[PDB]
């Protein structure tokens, strides 16, 4: 069981920030790190919980759910990554356990 989830937000008709993902996923556990990126022309993210069960719970509860009315559908799967490496704290990545990280470069 992996504590890291791979997330794709489809039908992105309104901006979804890293902080909004933190808000939504924090309901199911302690979010340690989040990194967002664009691939295959889709907004995606990797999110790490402290507990693999929290990841499982979030996937069951949130997969296929819209973040906002009529848009921003979450597609969630487990990642084989056992943890995440975050270099910076900014709009694209965040390590909630390391407030000392630079925002870039």
């Amino acid at each position: 069981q992996s504590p890291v989830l791979r997330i794709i937000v489809e039908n992105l008709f309104y901006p979804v920030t890293l902080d909004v993902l933190h808000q939504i996923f924090s309901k199911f556990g302690t979010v340690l790190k989040i990194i967002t990126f664009t691939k295959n022309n889709q907004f995606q993210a990797l999110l790490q919980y402290a507990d693999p069960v929290s990841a499982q719970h979030a996937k069951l509860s949130l997969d296929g759910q819209n973040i906002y009315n009529a848009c921003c559908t979450l597609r969630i799967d487990f990642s084989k990554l056992t943890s995440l490496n975050v270099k910076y704290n900014n709009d694209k990545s965040r390590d909630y356990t390391r407030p000392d990280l630079p925002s870039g470069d």
């Binding site: 309104y14 909004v20 939504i24 819209n66 973040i67 906002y68 009315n69 009529a70 921003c72």
Partner: peptide, 7 residues
């Protein structure tokens, strides 16, 4: 298609 949060 309701959402988790409001706008």
């Amino acid at each position: 298609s309701e959402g988790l949060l409001g706008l």
